[PDB]
Amino acid sequence: SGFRKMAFPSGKVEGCMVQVTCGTTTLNGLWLDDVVYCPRHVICTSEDMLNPNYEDLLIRKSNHNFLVQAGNVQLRVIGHSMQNCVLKLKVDTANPKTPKYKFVRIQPGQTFSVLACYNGSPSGVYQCAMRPNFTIKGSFLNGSCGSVGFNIDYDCVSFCYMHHMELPTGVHAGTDLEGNFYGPFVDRQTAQAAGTDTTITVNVLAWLYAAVINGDRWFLNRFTTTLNDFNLVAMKYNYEPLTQDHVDILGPLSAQTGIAVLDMCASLKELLQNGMNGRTILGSALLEDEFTPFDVVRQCSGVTFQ
Amino acid sequence: SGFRKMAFPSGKVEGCMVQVTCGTTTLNGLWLDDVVYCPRHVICTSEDMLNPNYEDLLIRKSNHNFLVQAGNVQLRVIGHSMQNCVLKLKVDTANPKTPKYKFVRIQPGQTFSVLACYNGSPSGVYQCAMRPNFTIKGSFLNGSCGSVGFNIDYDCVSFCYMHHMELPTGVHAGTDLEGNFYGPFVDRQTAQAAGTDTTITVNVLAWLYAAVINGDRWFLNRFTTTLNDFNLVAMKYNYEPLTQDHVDILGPLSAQTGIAVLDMCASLKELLQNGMNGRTILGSALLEDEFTPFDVVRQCSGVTFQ
Ligand SMILES: *[C@@H](*)C(=O)N(c1ccccc1)c1cncc(Cl)c1
Ligand SMILES: *[C@@H](*)C(=O)N(c1ccccc1)c1cncc(Cl)c1
């Protein structure tokens, strides 16, 4: 029992983190086989990151302008190319710690683990969700760009995020590992802002099921609701719509607890309309929306990775 | 910016986890140099864990009664001994992945990372605090016993916790790595219960400083308080006393923010007396007490580990 914001073991990713330096700019890179991936804004100085022409900045660079450090061991760069917003640095040594991996792009609503890094050295690991507005509520300081987000499935690391920037509200934006930004953000200095967010409804429902599995039942009730009537209430409280696929995905958790999905929707309705009245759910006084149905099944059932 | 429940990178500990099997009992062990550490209740069956005489149970065992698996590679046990509530299994191979380590015992109020494991295979990583009542609010299923808690300081892993059992309220108890339980718990079947807990005051204050550093200031006020007058209020709300050493420890965070410690106490007072009035602090609607002053400095300043 218990329920925690739980990340994947980070060791497989720790063995890929390196430090990339170009001029006075130092950030983090990801070393898989004989390529180091990193943000292309590694080639920018302070005045460069205003309206940068990255193609122009890159043709002015040489292989020897890039220093890659894997621990205390220097990696010789033998090739470089730009792909969207990431740089690909060909090095003369393949990483012997390369795990089985994929480059995947995730959906808003999905979760992943983040291994925060500084100067190529891992600092901490935590769980994040992709917000509906394509930002993430991360924890990142200066120098963290290049840190990656990932999921692990058995032995295989699915890299889904590379960190680039902080937005003015303190939230974070970055790219998938092909260099394509999540959401309407660019790797330059503009007035870009997050734009409005919503609560991830299916995840809140998953977490209420997590609570029932763990013995919190005070918020249950005898009422039911229709999907349409629930969706009317969700829209009023800035929750995103619930679909029949969301209902289907919640099926196993429904069947394990004996609580129909639309019955749990009725509970969520009351919670939105009445608040929590001085009580808590899984140690929280807010409706938590950063656990997916998969996350709940994994933690309340117990799947490992090798 | 941002503030997350952040664990240490787990890779150094992943390389020490093994599976230990005795009869039909399978759990997790920690392999450092040529010793595997695990709970001594590995030698108990179902009827054994009622009023077990562990000395009697152990003398009946042989080296070959213990199967240790490190991945898909079997480890030959060449010696065994009991030390308090842990078993020490001497194996014929030293773990080549042994990090620099220490066995430390932590204080209630301190935090650590937990690498949850099943069948010797890591499942997830998260942050925990030692509660004042010496339990931990973990996330553990059957088979997790033997999982360890730890902190990392540069390159050195300080192991502080080995998981043993779940108590009836869903919280968890275990030992330090010398086999000595945290709190008044025993590795047998009794009606043992957690006993009353308190909120870790110095940690709440640290977290309010974390919030100010990150831009939440709504809870600040012009009032101050004396240490004695604050401690009168804390006792009424089941917070533990704040000492002059707590005030000293909060010094750097006070100086970084320009908010005197006793001024932040005045804010906490008002928060305890008035609630949070529909607002949140660092994304939480409760006063959070599982970050130490060290945790806040590490995350809001950015220290790594190698
Ligand atoms: C990612 C990175 O290294 N950035 C810096 C920081 C300082 C000098 C050059 C580059 C960075 C950080 N945040 C946003 C952007 Cl566009 C670049
Ligand atoms: C730690 C462990 O392996 N336990 C079991 C579980 C099933 C059979 C034997 C031993 C265990 C779990 N929780 C409490 C205690 Cl005293 C033992």
XYZ file of C-alpha atoms in Angstrom, chain B:
306
model
C 12.517 27.418 -10.921
C 9.958 24.814 -9.857
C 9.937 22.518 -6.854
C 9.488 18.748 -6.989
C 9.803 15.759 -4.711
C 13.164 14.827 -6.155
C 15.089 11.649 -5.498
C 18.753 10.898 -6.000
C 19.738 9.192 -9.254
C 19.349 5.521 -8.464
C 21.889 3.914 -10.781
C 24.552 3.316 -8.126
C 22.023 1.434 -6.024
C 20.465 -0.435 -8.981
C 23.801 -2.164 -9.496
C 23.661 -3.645 -5.990
C 20.175 -5.161 -6.008
C 19.895 -8.963 -6.088
C 17.197 -11.569 -5.483
C 17.488 -13.791 -2.401
C 15.450 -16.981 -2.140
C 15.152 -19.420 0.768
C 12.532 -22.137 0.432
C 9.421 -20.528 -1.037
C 10.373 -17.073 0.319
C 11.864 -14.655 -2.221
C 12.854 -11.058 -1.432
C 15.488 -8.428 -2.225
C 19.107 -8.240 -1.127
C 21.867 -5.626 -1.241
C 25.193 -6.848 -2.674
C 28.229 -4.804 -1.587
C 31.706 -6.307 -1.999
C 31.268 -10.046 -1.245
C 28.276 -9.775 1.160
C 24.528 -9.804 0.429
C 22.391 -8.067 3.078
C 18.709 -8.934 3.398
C 15.929 -9.213 6.004
C 16.342 -12.205 8.271
C 12.651 -12.989 7.797
C 13.787 -14.529 4.479
C 14.254 -17.732 6.517
C 10.635 -17.737 7.745
C 7.676 -19.524 6.197
C 4.032 -18.588 6.806
C 3.630 -20.454 10.107
C 7.165 -19.393 11.100
C 6.365 -15.657 11.250
C 4.081 -15.938 14.294
C 6.523 -16.179 17.232
C 9.768 -17.000 15.388
C 12.957 -17.983 17.183
C 15.340 -16.766 14.481
C 18.432 -18.306 16.068
C 16.713 -21.704 15.996
C 15.525 -21.223 12.416
C 18.986 -20.201 11.208
C 21.084 -23.018 12.731
C 18.793 -25.380 10.774
C 19.903 -23.735 7.508
C 22.902 -24.343 5.231
C 24.730 -22.150 2.732
C 23.076 -24.081 -0.115
C 19.632 -23.264 1.301
C 20.187 -19.670 0.074
C 19.940 -18.912 -3.650
C 21.190 -15.475 -4.685
C 20.553 -14.232 -8.225
C 22.240 -11.120 -9.627
C 20.350 -10.662 -12.859
C 20.499 -13.996 -14.656
C 23.747 -14.939 -12.875
C 23.676 -17.090 -9.749
C 25.857 -16.228 -6.774
C 27.357 -19.013 -4.694
C 26.803 -18.463 -0.961
C 29.867 -19.434 1.082
C 28.910 -18.143 4.524
C 25.967 -16.801 6.492
C 25.477 -14.950 9.752
C 22.732 -13.020 11.467
C 23.214 -9.473 12.711
C 20.212 -8.095 14.581
C 17.340 -8.177 12.082
C 19.446 -8.560 8.901
C 21.145 -11.586 7.400
C 24.663 -11.282 5.966
C 25.297 -13.782 3.136
C 28.960 -14.164 2.177
C 29.171 -14.888 -1.551
C 32.159 -16.006 -3.585
C 32.067 -12.970 -5.913
C 32.579 -9.335 -4.974
C 30.133 -6.992 -6.695
C 32.196 -5.153 -9.358
C 29.611 -2.340 -9.302
C 30.082 -1.638 -5.573
C 29.992 2.152 -5.110
C 31.719 4.011 -2.356
C 29.257 3.614 0.507
C 28.452 4.091 4.182
C 25.905 2.576 6.558
C 24.331 5.517 8.409
C 21.313 5.772 10.660
C 19.090 8.797 10.114
C 16.968 10.906 12.508
C 13.202 11.431 12.270
C 12.738 14.513 10.134
C 15.450 13.515 7.633
C 14.703 12.479 4.034
C 16.024 9.786 1.713
C 15.406 8.144 -1.631
C 13.827 4.677 -1.844
C 14.501 2.287 -4.755
C 11.500 -0.051 -4.655
C 12.391 -3.540 -5.834
C 10.677 -6.847 -6.571
C 12.536 -10.131 -7.174
C 15.808 -8.191 -7.162
C 14.624 -5.921 -10.021
C 14.175 -2.152 -9.453
C 10.632 -0.869 -10.030
C 10.681 2.844 -9.126
C 12.392 5.577 -7.129
C 10.861 8.182 -4.818
C 11.599 10.438 -1.877
C 10.495 9.624 1.724
C 10.943 11.240 5.149
C 11.501 9.393 8.442
C 8.389 10.351 10.374
C 8.682 11.485 14.005
C 7.086 8.142 14.926
C 9.847 6.275 13.004
C 7.547 5.012 10.231
C 7.722 5.993 6.606
C 4.863 6.782 4.245
C 6.213 4.595 1.467
C 4.773 2.813 -1.530
C 5.450 -0.898 -1.238
C 3.718 -4.096 -2.305
C 4.324 -7.702 -1.350
C 7.855 -8.750 -2.212
C 9.351 -5.299 -1.635
C 11.072 -6.179 1.620
C 14.815 -5.764 1.237
C 14.443 -2.586 -0.803
C 16.740 0.087 0.560
C 16.673 3.802 1.248
C 19.697 6.018 0.738
C 21.218 9.445 0.198
C 24.099 10.343 -2.135
C 26.868 12.811 -1.331
C 29.185 13.340 -4.286
C 30.147 9.770 -5.164
C 29.229 8.062 -1.879
C 25.984 6.218 -1.140
C 24.856 6.468 2.488
C 22.448 3.572 2.969
C 20.070 4.343 5.785
C 17.009 2.066 5.422
C 16.050 -1.512 4.598
C 12.337 -2.158 4.226
C 10.731 -4.945 6.272
C 6.968 -4.609 6.800
C 3.706 -2.733 6.344
C 1.795 -1.629 9.450
C -2.028 -1.711 9.632
C -2.450 1.985 8.745
C -0.601 1.374 5.460
C 2.690 2.971 6.597
C 6.030 1.176 6.622
C 8.748 0.151 9.035
C 12.230 -1.179 8.565
C 15.763 -1.197 9.862
C 19.009 0.595 9.366
C 21.610 -1.444 7.476
C 23.009 -2.917 10.709
C 19.629 -4.595 11.231
C 18.352 -2.280 13.982
C 14.720 -1.270 13.568
C 13.613 2.307 13.295
C 11.146 2.678 16.147
C 9.390 0.136 18.361
C 8.738 -2.523 15.716
C 9.733 -6.197 15.520
C 10.023 -8.601 12.592
C 7.209 -10.899 13.689
C 3.405 -11.012 13.744
C 2.036 -8.823 16.534
C -0.645 -6.150 16.769
C 2.065 -3.459 16.504
C 0.805 -0.063 15.352
C 2.387 3.220 14.315
C 1.517 5.346 17.328
C 0.886 9.060 17.161
C 2.777 11.310 14.707
C 3.572 15.022 14.521
C 4.342 17.474 11.714
C 8.020 18.275 11.133
C 8.052 22.037 11.846
C 11.537 22.909 10.629
C 10.751 21.218 7.313
C 7.511 23.173 6.809
C 9.514 26.371 7.348
C 12.139 25.233 4.844
C 9.377 24.636 2.301
C 7.857 28.081 2.866
C 11.329 29.462 2.118
C 11.366 27.275 -1.010
C 8.087 28.908 -2.021
C 9.372 32.475 -1.493
C 12.487 31.671 -3.558
C 10.115 30.443 -6.275
C 7.737 33.452 -6.167
C 4.840 32.447 -3.853
C 4.674 35.293 -1.292
C 0.967 35.642 -0.510
C 1.366 34.070 2.957
C 3.975 36.584 4.142
C 3.071 39.285 6.620
C 4.525 42.199 8.579
C 4.123 40.499 11.967
C 6.823 38.706 13.898
C 6.749 36.307 16.818
C 8.960 35.068 19.602
C 10.243 31.504 19.575
C 8.274 30.758 22.756
C 5.015 32.204 21.434
C 5.388 30.273 18.184
C 6.097 27.047 20.087
C 2.858 27.545 22.019
C 0.954 27.586 18.723
C 2.876 24.625 17.258
C 2.058 22.414 20.224
C -1.638 23.229 19.803
C -1.599 22.056 16.153
C 0.512 18.928 16.794
C 3.685 20.418 15.289
C 6.922 19.537 16.947
C 8.894 22.170 18.860
C 11.214 24.509 16.968
C 14.643 24.908 18.569
C 17.408 27.484 18.312
C 19.338 24.916 16.247
C 16.393 24.741 13.827
C 16.520 28.540 13.629
C 20.279 28.418 13.021
C 19.864 25.726 10.325
C 17.310 27.955 8.571
C 19.863 30.805 8.585
C 21.115 30.597 4.983
C 17.563 30.364 3.596
C 16.602 33.334 5.755
C 19.550 35.314 4.425
C 18.885 34.408 0.790
C 15.259 35.578 1.036
C 15.641 38.464 3.488
C 12.859 37.012 5.646
C 13.790 36.562 9.296
C 13.154 33.060 10.622
C 10.810 34.264 13.369
C 8.988 36.316 10.726
C 8.373 33.132 8.751
C 7.181 31.548 12.001
C 4.588 34.333 12.228
C 3.433 33.392 8.718
C 3.191 29.718 9.671
C 1.173 30.716 12.763
C -1.373 32.555 10.607
C -1.493 29.650 8.145
C -2.204 27.215 10.981
C -4.861 29.492 12.495
C -6.564 30.522 9.240
C -5.910 27.797 6.712
C -4.948 28.608 3.156
C -8.291 30.085 2.089
C -8.532 28.459 -1.335
C -4.922 29.200 -2.314
C -1.935 26.914 -2.815
C 1.774 26.945 -2.024
C 4.158 25.304 -4.509
C 1.164 23.490 -6.016
C -0.049 22.110 -2.674
C -3.105 22.940 -0.568
C -1.436 21.469 2.558
C 1.615 22.530 4.531
C 4.292 20.149 3.277
C 6.756 18.744 5.809
C 8.952 16.248 3.860
C 11.645 18.648 2.561
C 14.610 19.455 4.828
C 16.522 22.751 4.697
C 19.249 20.788 2.887
C 16.723 19.525 0.325
C 15.580 23.077 -0.403
C 19.112 24.459 -0.736
C 20.055 21.555 -3.026
C 17.099 22.044 -5.364
C 16.824 25.844 -5.387
C 20.688 26.136 -5.844
C 21.554 23.025 -7.891
C 24.061 20.513 -6.488
C 24.925 17.359 -8.492
C 26.579 14.038 -7.599
C 29.336 12.012 -9.270
